[PDB]
Amino acid sequence: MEPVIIGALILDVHAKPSTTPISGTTVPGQVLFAPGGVARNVADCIFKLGITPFMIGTLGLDGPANVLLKEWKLSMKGILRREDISTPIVSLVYDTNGEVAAGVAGVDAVENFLTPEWIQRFEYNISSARLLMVDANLSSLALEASCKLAAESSVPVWFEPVSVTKSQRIASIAKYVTIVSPNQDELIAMANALCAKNLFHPLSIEDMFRALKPAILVLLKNGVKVVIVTLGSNGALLCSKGNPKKALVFKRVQSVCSPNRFSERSPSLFAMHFPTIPAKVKKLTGAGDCLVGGTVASLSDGLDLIQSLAVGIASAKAAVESDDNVPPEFKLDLISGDAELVYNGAKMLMSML
Amino acid sequence: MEPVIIGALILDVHAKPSTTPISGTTVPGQVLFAPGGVARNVADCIFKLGITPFMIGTLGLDGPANVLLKEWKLSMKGILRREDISTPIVSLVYDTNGEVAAGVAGVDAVENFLTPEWIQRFEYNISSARLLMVDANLSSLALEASCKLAAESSVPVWFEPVSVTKSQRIASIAKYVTIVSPNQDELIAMANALCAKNLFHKLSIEDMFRALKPAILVLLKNGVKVVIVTLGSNGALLCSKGNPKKALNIDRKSGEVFKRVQSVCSPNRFSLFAMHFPTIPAKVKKLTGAGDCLVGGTVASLSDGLDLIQSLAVGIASAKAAVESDDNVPPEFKLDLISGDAELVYNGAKMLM
Ligand code: NA
Ligand code: NA
Numbered sequence: 001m002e003p004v005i006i007g008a009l010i011l012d013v014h015a016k017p018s019t020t021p022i023s024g025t026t027v028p029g030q031v032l033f034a035p036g037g038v039a040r041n042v043a044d045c046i047f048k049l050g051i052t053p054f055m056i057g058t059l060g061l062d063g064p065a066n067v068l069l070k071e072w073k074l075s076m077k078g079i080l081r082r083e084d085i086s087t088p089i090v091s092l093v094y095d096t097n098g099e100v101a102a103g104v105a106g107v108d109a110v111e112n113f114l115t116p117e118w119i120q121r122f123e124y125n126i127s128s129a130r131l132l133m134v135d136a137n138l139s140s141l142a143l144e145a146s147c148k149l150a151a152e153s154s155v156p157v158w159f160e161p162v163s164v165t166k167s168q169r170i171a172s173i174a175k176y177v178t179i180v181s182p183n184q185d186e187l188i189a190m191a192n193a194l195c196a197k198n199l200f201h202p203l204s205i206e207d208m209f210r211a212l213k214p215a216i217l218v219l220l221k222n223g224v225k226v227v228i229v230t231l232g233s234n235g236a237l238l239c240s241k242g243n244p245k246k247a248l249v250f251k252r253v254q255s256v257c258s259p260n261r262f263s264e265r266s267p268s269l270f271a272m273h274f275p276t277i278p279a280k281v282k283k284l285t286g287a288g289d290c291l292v293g294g295t296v297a298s299l300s301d302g303l304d305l306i307q308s309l310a311v312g313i314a315s316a317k318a319a320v321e322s323d324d325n326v327p328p329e330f331k332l333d334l335i336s337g338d339a340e341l342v343y344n345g346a347k348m349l350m351s352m353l
Numbered sequence: 354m355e356p357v358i359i360g361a362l363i364l365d366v367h368a369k370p371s372t373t374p375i376s377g378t379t380v381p382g383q384v385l386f387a388p389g390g391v392a393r394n395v396a397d398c399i400f401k402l403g404i405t406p407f408m409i410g411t412l413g414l415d416g417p418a419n420v421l422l423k424e425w426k427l428s429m430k431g432i433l434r435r436e437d438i439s440t441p442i443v444s445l446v447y448d449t450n451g452e453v454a455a456g457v458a459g460v461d462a463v464e465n466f467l468t469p470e471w472i473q474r475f476e477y478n479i480s481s482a483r484l485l486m487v488d489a490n491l492s493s494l495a496l497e498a499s500c501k502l503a504a505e506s507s508v509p510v511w512f513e514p515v516s517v518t519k520s521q522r523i524a525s526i527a528k529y530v531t532i533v534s535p536n537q538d539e540l541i542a543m544a545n546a547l548c549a550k551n552l553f554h555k556l557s558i559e560d561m562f563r564a565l566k567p568a569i570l571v572l573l574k575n576g577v578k579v580v581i582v583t584l585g586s587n588g589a590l591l592c593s594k595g596n597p598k599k600a601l602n603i604d605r606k607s608g609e610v611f612k613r614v615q616s617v618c619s620p621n622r623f624s625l626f627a628m629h630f631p632t633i634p635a636k637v638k639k640l641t642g643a644g645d646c647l648v649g650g651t652v653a654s655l656s657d658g659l660d661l662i663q664s665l666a667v668g669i670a671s672a673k674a675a676v677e678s679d680d681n682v683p684p685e686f687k688l689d690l691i692s693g694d695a696e697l698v699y700n701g702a703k704m705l706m
Contacts, residue, residue, distance in 0.1 A: 011416075013366050013384070015444040015457035026456035031366070031442040033416035063386070063423045067416040089384040091368035093446050093455040102446040102455045103379035104368035163378055185378075 003046065003300045004126050006056040006119060006146055007039025007135030007160075008110045009079070011064035012325065013091040014283065021093055021101055035068050036090060036325050037107075038135040038160050038289050044326045045293025045315060047074060049335075050249040051300050054078055054125050058113045060087035078125070080118050085109050098281045098320075110137045116145035127153040130300045133292065134159055136166035143169055147176035156248050160292055161186040168193035175223040178248065181292055183230050184212060191215035194222045205273045209237060209349050213269075220269065226305065228295075230288055235276040235342075237349075238309055242266050250301045250311070252336040257307045257343040264348065271349035274309055277338050279317045286325025291316040293326070294335075307343065314338035356399065356656050357479050359409040359472065359499055360392025360488030361463045361515075362432070364417045365641075365681065366444040374446070374454055386420055389443065389681050391488035391513050391645050393421075397682040398642075398649025398671060400427060402691075403608045404656045406486075407431055407478050411466040413440035431478070433471050438462050463490045469498030480506040483603045483656055486648070487512055489519035496522055500529035509601065513648055514539035521546040527575040534581045534648055537565060544568035547575045558629050562590060562705055566627075573625065581651075581665065583644055588698075590705075591628040591665055598623060600660045610667065611657040613692040618663045618699040627706040630665055633694050635673045642681030647672040649682070650691075663699065670694035 017029035035044070043053045056078040059065040064087035069076075088107035095101040119126075119142060126132055132150040134143055134157065143159075150157050156178040161167030167186040170177065171193040182190055188200045191214075200215050208231065216227050216239050225247040229237040240247045243266050245259075294315030298308035314335045318327050370382030388397065392410060399406045409431035412418045417440035422429070441460035448454045472479075472495060479485055485503040487496060487510065496512075503510050509531040514520030520539035523530065524546045535543060541553045544567075553568050561584065569580050569592050579599070582590035591597060598620070650671025654664035670691045674683045 013442075013444060015455075015459075017455075017457045021455040021457065023455070024453055026443060026445065026453070026458040028461075029457040029459055030439070031444045031457055031459040032439070063420040067419060070416075089386075090379055091366055091384045091444060091446060092379070093444065093457055100377055100379070102368075102374055102376070104370045104382040104384055104446060105379045106368075106382065106384045165381075 001128050001130045002052050002054045002125070003131040003133065003296055004054045004056065004122070004129040005039050005043040005046070005133045006114070006138065008037035008088055008107055008137035009040040009057045009059055009068055010037035010088040010090050010107060011067055012036030012285070013089065014285065015091070015093045016283070017094065017096070020096060032323065033067055034324055036286070037088065038137065038162055039133070040068070041286050041289035041325045042133060042160070042293040042296065043074065045290045046297040046300070048326065048330050049294065049297040049315070051297045056119060056122055058085060058109060058118070060085045060109070062087050064089060078122055080113060085113050092285065094283070098284050107137055111139040114138060114142055116142055119146050123149055126150055126155065129155050131155065131296055132157045133296055136160060136162040136169050140169050140172050143173050147173045151176040158292065158296060161190060164189045170194065174219070177224050179226040179228065180219065180224055181228045181230060181288065183232070183288070187212060187215050187227070187229050191218040194218050205234065206349065209271060209273070212237070217269065228309065230291060233276060236274045236291070236309065236313060238272050238274060238306070240270045241268065242270065244270055244305045248299065248305060249332070250298055250303055252332065253298065253307055253311055253339050254303060256336065256340045257310060259304055259307070261343070262306070268353050273347050273349060274313055274342055275345045276313055277317045277341055279321050281320045282323050284320050286319045287316045290319035290326055306346070310339040310343040310346070311335065313342045354481055354483060356404065356406045356484040356486060356652055357409065357475070357482040358392050358396040358399070358406045358486045359491060361390035361441060361460060361490035362393040362410045362412055362421060363390035363441045363443055363460060364421045365389035366442060368444070368446040370447065370449070372449045374448060387641065387681055388421055390441065391490065391515050392486065394642050394645035394681045395486055395513070395649040395652065396427065398646045399653040399656070401682065401686045402650065402653040402671070403610055404653045407482070409472065409475055411438060411462055411471070413438040413462065415440050417442055431475055433466060435466070438466050460490065464492045467491060467495050469494050472498050472502070476502055479503055479508065482508050483601050484508065484652055485510045486652055489513060489515040489522050493522050493525055496526050500526045504529040511648065511652060514543065517542045523547070527572065527577055530577050532579040532581065533572065533577055534583060534644070536583045536585070536644070540565060540568050540580070540582055544571040547571050558587060559705060561587070562627065562629070565590070570625070579661065583647060586632060588632040589630045589647065589665065589669060591630060591661070593626050595624065595626070597626045597628055598660050598662055600658070601655050603658070605658060608657045609688055610654060610691070611659055613688060614654065614659055614663055614667055614695055617692055617696045618666060620660060620663070622699070623662060625706065628662070629703045629705055630669055630698055631701040632669055633673050633697055635677050637676045638679040640676055641679065642675040643672045646675035646682060662702065666695040666699040666702070667691060669698045
């Protein structure tokens, strides 16, 4: 009952300049190819954590596809390859921060060729899936087809907003979505999209949460059960409608991250903050994807959402310390240790909605 | 026999956005890969014109190399490939205007790994070459080793000034160099490098020539035999020590480019000699590769037995084909079109001195 991952397979071009990038000319630095795309990264992360995912995507019969598939050890029956299709490419120019200064995509092969027609071939896989994860690179039509299959079989759906623009695609599928994982810009865009108007616009944790609470409520009322807001270096917010456990390799995590840790019996809005762990950043790209991958893998292994999120945040830290979007391997003892640190450090927010 | 091409093999990455370039995230647009590097471009241009060159360069055993070499149909024995090497890449992110918003270049593989030691492996190739073409991407040591090998065997050397900065690498090898092909910024930079002081720092053709004559003479005084100043849309300037109608001292036993051009570009039409060659009006799609194909077209023509005046005309024709292509080098050359354009340039050529 493998988790099913649907979305983009992208060849990433990462340009980290030695000095500050200046207009009108090139500056010295390093430029690397990295296997990318939210869905590909999530699948890769889940696999390296010891769970086999099923990948549904589309690739070309070109050079970039041959880079992405060189060391691909998962099934490829879910991957649509034809010659008319041009493999998606994202080109990023970083700053010295490790943040993106300028990026271009690059990815309309996904919206045009990862169709409902292709996804419906795998109705059994989605139906029997432990979890369905879709990224917003999919078209509204593909997202509808995907999410309606999982809902039919009562399979929980994870929607990754990918960007501010593409996050608005939550609008037509919100009912079917169980979990979303936006940052604070994407959360705002999603809230605006469901509100049909531009009602929301993009410090301490209780300030940030109080500022995002109206936007979070919008998503919850539109049928989303769990909203995970990634706050980068100040961790993540886990917000859910009802008890977070009721909303939906790792027996180490189950041991040390006790499910009996949190005494709190079913609120309309549940909120708690997860801290992140200090890390030696080489590239922040892929951090969010590994959070999702780490979380899905744990949920797929029978852990609850609170335990799974800690694993996700652990995986995110490992990812920023690599020059890949997803690290070449995961060290389980490191993953478990970091997860416990995050888990034990998780605190609850907020007595009347 | 075969012309030897030594220099950079670069993967060019052009990111031209739909619009709205913003920090912190990817933005919609198109990203293209283009096989680049002056030497690689010259080699490709020469081959498509029906002459086989020998390429000496350095590449990695990575993804960029596999994109770069995918449709490479020439020998690879002159190309140093090792796991230590990361394939040179120039990554450019444009704005709506078409100017570079941010650019990063990682091309230190050429200067660090294309050593004199590697070049001396192909001493037989360089010695027996009809012509030797080196780009300024090479280190000074690599340039010295290559050009002194050619000088011993009296093999003509073509030095291509990659940029204003790298053009100054002519300083230690000017003695060995037969032909240089700078634009006028590069010509000034090379002149200053050769001089004991920095004496050099819209216009009509004989006016622009009269302004460049001192800088041109400097190069001539230092041993350069032929100076070709590329003037973009104002054609090219051909200045030489002695008669301009020079040819490659190679036995007759030719090809299709030779007897097409020779028929149509009569050799009976035509110290220091100076000519101006006009360019041909063209549908510019991208100026990419224009200078390189001017070099490529001229070398190819010289290699098939044409004189310098005939060869330069082909080069400007080839340069035109390159600007009306949007690969650095056009996918193919239509020899009839090249020949027709060459006659236009040839017949439009004017004596200045
Ligand atoms: Na990373
Ligand atoms: Na071009």
